[PDB]
Design an enzyme around this catalytic site. Structure first.
Site, mmCIF file in Angstrom:
data_model
loop_
_atom_site.group_PDB
_atom_site.id
_atom_site.type_symbol
_atom_site.label_atom_id
_atom_site.label_comp_id
_atom_site.label_asym_id
_atom_site.label_seq_id
_atom_site.Cartn_x
_atom_site.Cartn_y
_atom_site.Cartn_z
ATOM 1 N N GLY A 126 0.807 -1.213 0.000
ATOM 2 C CA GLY A 126 0.000 0.000 0.000
ATOM 3 C C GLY A 126 0.839 1.262 0.000
ATOM 4 O O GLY A 126 2.075 1.197 -0.031
ATOM 5 N N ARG A 127 0.167 2.425 0.021
ATOM 6 C CA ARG A 127 0.823 3.729 0.028
ATOM 7 C C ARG A 127 -0.015 4.760 0.766
ATOM 8 O O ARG A 127 -1.175 4.986 0.421
ATOM 9 C CB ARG A 127 1.149 4.211 -1.402
ATOM 10 C CG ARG A 127 2.041 5.460 -1.450
ATOM 11 C CD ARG A 127 1.956 6.157 -2.794
ATOM 12 N NE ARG A 127 2.695 7.423 -2.819
ATOM 13 C CZ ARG A 127 2.713 8.258 -3.857
ATOM 14 N NH1 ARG A 127 2.033 7.972 -4.963
ATOM 15 N NH2 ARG A 127 3.409 9.386 -3.796
ATOM 16 N N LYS B 259 8.282 0.105 6.154
ATOM 17 C CA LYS B 259 7.510 1.300 5.891
ATOM 18 C C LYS B 259 8.478 2.412 5.590
ATOM 19 O O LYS B 259 9.142 2.888 6.493
ATOM 20 C CB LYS B 259 6.599 1.653 7.081
ATOM 21 C CG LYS B 259 5.650 2.839 6.823
ATOM 22 C CD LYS B 259 5.214 3.515 8.116
ATOM 23 C CE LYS B 259 3.938 2.959 8.707
ATOM 24 N NZ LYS B 259 3.623 3.572 10.022
ATOM 25 N N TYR C 295 2.336 10.044 3.511
ATOM 26 C CA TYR C 295 3.718 10.296 3.915
ATOM 27 C C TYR C 295 4.519 8.991 4.088
ATOM 28 O O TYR C 295 5.641 9.023 4.602
ATOM 29 C CB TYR C 295 3.740 11.140 5.215
ATOM 30 C CG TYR C 295 2.792 12.324 5.207
ATOM 31 C CD1 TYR C 295 3.029 13.428 4.393
ATOM 32 C CD2 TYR C 295 1.669 12.348 6.028
ATOM 33 C CE1 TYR C 295 2.163 14.524 4.384
ATOM 34 C CE2 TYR C 295 0.791 13.436 6.026
ATOM 35 C CZ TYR C 295 1.040 14.523 5.199
ATOM 36 O OH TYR C 295 0.190 15.608 5.187
ATOM 37 N N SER C 296 3.949 7.849 3.630
ATOM 38 C CA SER C 296 4.544 6.518 3.761
ATOM 39 C C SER C 296 4.291 5.594 2.564
ATOM 40 O O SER C 296 3.319 5.767 1.840
ATOM 41 C CB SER C 296 4.023 5.840 5.023
ATOM 42 O OG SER C 296 2.629 5.583 4.915
ATOM 43 N N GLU C 297 5.159 4.590 2.395
ATOM 44 C CA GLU C 297 5.050 3.552 1.371
ATOM 45 C C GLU C 297 5.364 2.234 2.065
ATOM 46 O O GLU C 297 6.427 2.105 2.666
ATOM 47 C CB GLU C 297 5.989 3.827 0.198
ATOM 48 C CG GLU C 297 5.461 3.245 -1.099
ATOM 49 C CD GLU C 297 5.844 4.010 -2.352
ATOM 50 O OE1 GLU C 297 7.038 3.978 -2.733
ATOM 51 O OE2 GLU C 297 4.935 4.590 -2.987
ATOM 52 N N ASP D 8 -5.875 7.249 15.906
ATOM 53 C CA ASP D 8 -6.215 6.854 14.533
ATOM 54 C C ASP D 8 -6.776 5.454 14.462
ATOM 55 O O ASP D 8 -6.602 4.752 13.446
ATOM 56 C CB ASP D 8 -5.013 7.030 13.582
ATOM 57 C CG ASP D 8 -5.339 7.168 12.091
ATOM 58 O OD1 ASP D 8 -6.519 7.499 11.749
ATOM 59 O OD2 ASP D 8 -4.409 7.015 11.268
#
Ligand SMILES: NC(=O)CCNCc1ccc(-c2ccccc2)c(Cl)c1
Length: 327
Positions: free
Chosen positions: A45-46, A67, A49-51, A155
């Site tokens: 996933g993406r 990550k 501010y992260s991949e 979150d």
């Protein structure tokens, strides 16, 4: 004389009574390992501010999660790293195994234990009433733990809960928005995903605590038991409060804003309306009735309350009759 102060009813001064090193993430010293010991397999996933990548540690042929972080604010990277290290080994908290940077680009990456996430699209039909209570209990174990440790997730949502249903393993992930709870601190309200934002964030009540994660858990439970995803379908942040008001009613919304001396944004004036308090049973249909029970409704009713102080704590929640059938 402004809004009324508030503080958590549990774990209030756990950070106050601890050393500065435990909670001062700006002063945290991070030591990166070398990325070369890792082999990237596939994109999972993406984020914004992260991949997220699935990988193998070449030294032991072990599946890991990598990550890669965009260095938007180093302070936030330091905060996530500090929190992950403090919570390491906690019940059902994602394990941070390593921190590395790519020698050439210098982009920071977090290395985590691997969770074999069960096909959720196909999972939505095979889960039962027992499954929901079991997994709900496991998320509460994670929350009671991070709250006892002076951290709020901020979150909580299906996306941040990994489940390996074959091995009945659950992990709470993406601690990128987590923060240390300091009584009296005013926090930024631009946290959590829209559908999961507690009324405190929506009305701009900055002095929130761990009970925010308890609101998000309620949103999740309501969507699970009622098969209505998401439960509170707002189209913007102002609309989100209206969606809540359509269920909890406007009466208790004023009881809440009056209790804390909250100034309602003038943008709500035209859209809020007047809504009666609904009954949870109204959400029961042929599709969901096999997952809904009196205990489930009583539990739900006690989580989704406007007043953050009236919400059950993760501890109180674990004791509720909804969980009597689970270990
Ligand atoms: N990042 C991902 O794709 C993982 C997506 N997360 C899947 C998922 C599946 C089931 C549940 C659940 C919720 C309540 C009771 C029982 C189970 C949750 Cl919270 C999450």
């Amino acid at each position: 004389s402004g809004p009324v102060p508030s503080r958590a009813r549990v774990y209030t001064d756990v950070n106050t009574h601890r050393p500065s090193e435990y909670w001062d993430y700006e002063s945290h010293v991070v030591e990166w390992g070398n990325q070369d010991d890792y082999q990237l397999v596939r994109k999972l996933g993406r984020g914004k501010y992260s991949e997220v990548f699935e990988a193998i540690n070449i030294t032991n042929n072990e599946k890991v999660v990598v990550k890669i972080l965009k260095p938007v604010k180093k302070k936030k990277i330091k905060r996530e790293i500090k929190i992950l290290e403090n919570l390491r080994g906690g019940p059902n908290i994602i394990t941070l195994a390593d921190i590395v940077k790519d020698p050439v680009s210098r982009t920071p990456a977090l290395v985590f234990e691997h969770v074999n996430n069960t096909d959720f699209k196909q999972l939505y039909q095979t889960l039962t009433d027992y499954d929901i209570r079991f997994y709900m209990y496991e998320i509460l174990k994670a929350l009671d733990y991070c709250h006892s440790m002076g951290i709020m997730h901020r979150d909580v949502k299906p996306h941040n809960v990994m489940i390996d249903h074959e091995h009945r393993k659950l992990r709470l992930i993406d601690w990128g928005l987590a923060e240390f709870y300091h009584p009296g601190q005013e926090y930024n309200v631009r946290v959590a995903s829209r559908y999961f934002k507690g009324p405190e964030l929506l009305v701009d009540y900055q002095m929130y605590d761990y009970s925010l994660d308890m609101w998000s858990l309620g949103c999740m439970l309501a969507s699970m038991i009622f098969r209505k995803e998401p439960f509170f379908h707002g189209h913007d942040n102002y609309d989100q409060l209206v969606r809540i008001a359509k269920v909890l009613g406007t009466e208790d919304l004023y009881d809440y804003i009056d209790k804390y001396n909250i100034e309602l944004d003038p943008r709500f004036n035209d859209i809020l309306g007047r809504h009666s308090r609904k009954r949870w049973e109204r959400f029961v249909h042929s599709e969901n009735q096999h997952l809904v029970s009196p205990e489930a409704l009583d539990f739900l009713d006690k989580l989704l309350r406007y007043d953050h102080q009236s919400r059950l704590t993760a501890r109180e929640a674990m004791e509720h009759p909804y969980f009597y059938t689970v270990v």
